[PDB]
Write a protein that binds this ligand. Sequence first.
Ligand SMILES: *[C@@H]1O[C@H](CO)[C@@H](O[C@@H]2O[C@H](CO)[C@@H](O)[C@H](O)[C@H]2NC(C)=O)[C@H](O)[C@H]1NC(C)=O
Ligand SMILES: *[C@@H]1O[C@H](CO)[C@@H](O[C@@H]2O[C@H](CO)[C@@H](O)[C@H](O)[C@H]2NC(C)=O)[C@H](O)[C@H]1NC(C)=O
Ligand SMILES: *[C@@H]1O[C@H](CO)[C@@H](O[C@@H]2O[C@H](CO)[C@@H](O)[C@H](O)[C@H]2NC(C)=O)[C@H](O)[C@H]1NC(C)=O
Ligand SMILES: *[C@@H]1O[C@H](CO)[C@@H](O[C@@H]2O[C@H](CO)[C@@H](O)[C@H](O)[C@H]2NC(C)=O)[C@H](O)[C@H]1NC(C)=O
Ligand SMILES: *[C@@H]1O[C@H](CO)[C@@H](O[C@@H]2O[C@H](CO)[C@@H](O)[C@H](O)[C@H]2NC(C)=O)[C@H](O)[C@H]1NC(C)=O
Ligand SMILES: *[C@@H]1O[C@H](CO)[C@@H](O[C@@H]2O[C@H](CO)[C@@H](O)[C@H](O)[C@H]2NC(C)=O)[C@H](O)[C@H]1NC(C)=O
Ligand SMILES: *[C@@H]1O[C@H](CO)[C@@H](O[C@@H]2O[C@H](CO)[C@@H](O)[C@H](O)[C@H]2NC(C)=O)[C@H](O)[C@H]1NC(C)=O
Ligand SMILES: *[C@@H]1O[C@H](CO)[C@@H](O[C@@H]2O[C@H](CO)[C@@H](O)[C@H](O)[C@H]2NC(C)=O)[C@H](O)[C@H]1NC(C)=O
Ligand code: NAG
Ligand code: NAG
Ligand code: NAG
Ligand code: NAG
Ligand code: NAG
Lengths: 121, 431, 187
Amino acid sequence: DVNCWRVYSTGSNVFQTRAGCLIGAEHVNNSYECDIPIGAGICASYQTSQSIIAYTMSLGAENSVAYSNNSIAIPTNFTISVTTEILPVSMTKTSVDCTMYICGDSTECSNLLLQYGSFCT
Amino acid sequence: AIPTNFTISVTTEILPVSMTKTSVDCTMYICGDSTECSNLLLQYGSFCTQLNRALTGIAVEQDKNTQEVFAQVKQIYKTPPIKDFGGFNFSQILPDPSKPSKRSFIEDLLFNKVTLADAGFIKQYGDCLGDIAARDLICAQKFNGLTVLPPLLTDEMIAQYTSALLAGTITSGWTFGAGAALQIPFAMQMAYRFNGIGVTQNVLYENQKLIANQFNSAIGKIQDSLSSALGKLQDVVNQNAQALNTLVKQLSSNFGAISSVLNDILSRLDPPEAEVQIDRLITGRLQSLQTYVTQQLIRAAEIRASANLAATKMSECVLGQSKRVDFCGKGYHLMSFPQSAPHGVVFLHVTYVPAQEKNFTTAPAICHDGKAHFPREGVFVSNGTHWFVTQRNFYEPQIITTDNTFVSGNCDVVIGIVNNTVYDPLQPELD
Amino acid sequence: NTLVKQLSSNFGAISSVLNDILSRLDPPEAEVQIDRLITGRLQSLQTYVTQQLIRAAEIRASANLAATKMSECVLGQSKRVDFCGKGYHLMSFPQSAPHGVVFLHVTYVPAQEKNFTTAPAICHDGKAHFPREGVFVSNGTHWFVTQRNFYEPQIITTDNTFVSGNCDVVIGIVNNTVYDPLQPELD
Ligand SMILES: *[C@@H]1O[C@H](CO)[C@@H](O[C@@H]2O[C@H](CO)[C@@H](O)[C@H](O)[C@H]2NC(C)=O)[C@H](O)[C@H]1NC(C)=O
Ligand SMILES: *[C@@H]1O[C@H](CO)[C@@H](O[C@@H]2O[C@H](CO)[C@@H](O)[C@H](O)[C@H]2NC(C)=O)[C@H](O)[C@H]1NC(C)=O
Ligand SMILES: *[C@@H]1O[C@H](CO)[C@@H](O[C@@H]2O[C@H](CO)[C@@H](O)[C@H](O)[C@H]2NC(C)=O)[C@H](O)[C@H]1NC(C)=O
Ligand SMILES: *[C@@H]1O[C@H](CO)[C@@H](O[C@@H]2O[C@H](CO)[C@@H](O)[C@H](O)[C@H]2NC(C)=O)[C@H](O)[C@H]1NC(C)=O
Ligand SMILES: *[C@@H]1O[C@H](CO)[C@@H](O[C@@H]2O[C@H](CO)[C@@H](O)[C@H](O)[C@H]2NC(C)=O)[C@H](O)[C@H]1NC(C)=O
Ligand SMILES: *[C@@H]1O[C@H](CO)[C@@H](O[C@@H]2O[C@H](CO)[C@@H](O)[C@H](O)[C@H]2NC(C)=O)[C@H](O)[C@H]1NC(C)=O
Ligand SMILES: *[C@@H]1O[C@H](CO)[C@@H](O[C@@H]2O[C@H](CO)[C@@H](O)[C@H](O)[C@H]2NC(C)=O)[C@H](O)[C@H]1NC(C)=O
Ligand SMILES: *[C@@H]1O[C@H](CO)[C@@H](O[C@@H]2O[C@H](CO)[C@@H](O)[C@H](O)[C@H]2NC(C)=O)[C@H](O)[C@H]1NC(C)=O
Ligand SMILES: *[C@@H]1O[C@H](CO)[C@@H](O)[C@H](O)[C@H]1NC(C)=O
Ligand SMILES: *[C@@H]1O[C@H](CO)[C@@H](O)[C@H](O)[C@H]1NC(C)=O
Ligand SMILES: *[C@@H]1O[C@H](CO)[C@@H](O)[C@H](O)[C@H]1NC(C)=O
Ligand SMILES: *[C@@H]1O[C@H](CO)[C@@H](O)[C@H](O)[C@H]1NC(C)=O
Ligand SMILES: *[C@@H]1O[C@H](CO)[C@@H](O)[C@H](O)[C@H]1NC(C)=O
């Protein structure tokens, strides 16, 4: 919530993003894949002397299709590819002894807790 | 009953994909700027850490949802300069290269129908000092530790992703979803898709102008119905806003204490007697934060199911042609186009609808010479006096020949067989 | 482990240890402190159980998805796009993992593409010929019909196309000959 001062220290490398004022990072004109998300399209990384750099994330490579009204492209060879997919199916089963947790081995606490048995059930 | 004409229909489907990301400063909400309350609250630090862990899980999940729906392909295709698509006009859904935001006309219309609670994420301290505070609801939220975090992808990046998806589908059909995009003329792709609902290619090639005109008119109807709808996307905004404002309002509860104001208690009472009242207030305000976080978790689970559905629709309706009924609109699915909406996605489903039906008498088989003839891929019909074979979804009568049927058995077993002649188109040539 | 750590909270009592309270205080004065501790620890257990319920719902959705994948990718061949990997799905093999499953999806990927000129139909004798299940392509000088996903050129014959109408309506029709593989045999 600062437009670059309500900051702890000014230092240098003060850079303004729509996510806020960023202090302590050098801004570069490249566009890499996102390492650490900052927000509003801005990402950060630790690069090469080593320093924190802040950039605008790239979405991917740009290639234009050669479209015409009488032109087709047919594959001539194929590839057989094997890929993996991971899925969770189950989690740990747990049980709680309510009196053991709340009172330990205190008899008086158990006599007091007898008023809340419905909640443990 | 066989249809004789068709209809090309475009319908819309709206899906929520993400919700607002929020963070809480626990001490700011519970104690304000009271040092004594903070020293008392140091006994409950684990609960504030636990609440923030749950909220950060929700916040990263929102970006994962948006990535899974919109960022499937990593090639940013560009639409060709020459717009020769056989008479189909996609200008209304392709990006306008003159507006600041490179958004299509329909996306611009959609974005003006959902009103966000706050535009922008930089509200400075000097901007609301004095009167403006406690009147404006956002500043009232921010003076009590309740902040809204911005999403990772901007609107412009999502518009870029949708334009890449559109260019891929209209220049390469469905090939770009399985590997490299292979270009093909748009009418030949349309003929392929007609093959996929059981209609021969010649129907498309003969009726191409009518089909293109029907598509263009339907797109115009979509446009004219939007400039006149998005309740599923407005209620998400409303729910988040209402929850944050309810948290701000719950700060006036006593919870069984003398007052709900800490400064009033701290004057007029000494520490040993002020501690019990402060303790009541602390317990109440921790309970309020806990309730907020629980309901945020349940809502995030619902949004996550919706975003999984949106990703499945993007894969199966936009990157291919789906044969499962009613998944991609009403009618036989032809193709779909995505458009980005604030916190969501809109799908334009183009489907095929059978239009004008006529009545015919029909028969399972034909008995020619003690043989039973069955259609290869059609149905036997009669106009009253004569017998033809046609295709099920469009009426195109033809003469029954041997290159048109197949024989199996005699005529003594099939229940409703009829007597007719089969041409056999070789006898004239042999003579 | 968070449940174990939350046992050191006072919840507004003199101490978080029951034995410390029970010595130094008589039952009527120890009861109010014990009551504070009891309320706090019941709240902790309640929070744990609620978050366990929400997590179990998410795992249940994941397991339903895994069962659907097992049915449609391993016990059959799926035609829905991207459900069983990237590419045209051929088959899948399951492997068990601790608390989960791993799927090995074998798919088919088109590899090396070549450019051709194409046409919707062929005009032979005032008739329009369309491919039965292929596409018409040209290497530049000659015209063949092939299949869409693999390049295997063939001569256009009548047992290979089908006729519909004349040549006056189709937008991009071209002129070529259709073999008709019966005339040589009749002669
Ligand atoms: C930070 O403040 C600067 C200075 O006021 C803002 O820059 C202005 O933004 C408005 C918004 O459209 C423009 O009309 C002005 O021309 C800009 N002026 C200058 C000198 O740049 C800026 O918008 C603020 N930062 C953020 C992220 O909102
Ligand atoms: C089709 O692709 C395969 C590989 O995917 C080609 O086989 C390779 O051919 C090169 C030389 O041509 C060899 O050095 C490799 O060892 C071969 N690989 C394998 C796995 O055998 C094949 O030649 C291609 N066919 C055509 C017609 O292009
Ligand atoms: C099939 O349906 C289309 C409309 O869905 C018909 O085209 C219309 O024909 C009427 C007169 O016959 C014209 O007034 C309309 O302007 C036409 N609409 C369009 C979009 O061109 C077509 O005639 C029908 N064909 C048959 C054989 O019934
Ligand atoms: C495709 O559709 C667009 C929009 O429907 C057409 O552009 C309009 O054309 C009319 C004239 O018929 C003009 O009065 C409008 O102002 C145009 N609108 C825009 C936004 O340009 C366009 O002519 C259609 N055909 C082609 C080939 O683009
Ligand atoms: C059913 O279809 C038959 C075959 O097309 C129709 O007979 C044709 O009628 C037209 C119009 O009189 C003639 O020009 C053709 O020569 C006829 N063909 C034959 C083979 O006779 C017949 O009219 C139709 N019957 C009904 C009741 O509509
Ligand atoms: C279809 O044709 C067959 C024979 O071509 C007919 O079967 C004969 O019908 C006559 C008179 O109905 C009987 O006397 C014969 O005994 C039948 N069986 C033979 C000749 O094997 C059959 O009835 C015809 N179906 C009709 C007219 O609906
Ligand atoms: C297109 O294909 C035709 C038909 O295969 C090619 O013509 C053949 O060329 C080979 C090599 O010279 C000859 O052995 C055949 O006898 C030719 N067949 C005919 C029917 O002429 C032609 O070379 C190809 N054109 C291009 C530009 O690649
Ligand atoms: C395909 O063949 C048809 C006839 O076989 C051509 O149509 C004739 O073309 C000539 C010269 O272009 C005209 O003078 C005739 O009037 C056309 N119509 C007839 C004879 O009915 C057609 O042009 C050919 N297509 C080509 C060469 O691309
Ligand atoms: C980045 O680009 C801007 C404008 O294009 C330029 O003024 C600036 O110097 C560039 N920075 C670097 C490090 O090249
Ligand atoms: C088909 O015949 C039935 C029988 O009366 C009639 O009710 C129906 O309207 C007919 N359908 C058409 C399209 O003529
Ligand atoms: C249809 O019903 C009629 C009686 O209404 C009967 O004579 C005829 O055999 C039936 N046809 C079939 C195929 O069952
Ligand atoms: C097909 O032709 C276009 C037109 O220039 C070209 O850019 C593209 O590389 C060609 N594809 C192949 C596989 O040669
Ligand atoms: C393809 O475009 C050319 C002009 O570039 C045009 O002459 C030709 O008729 C078009 N073909 C079809 C099938 O529309």
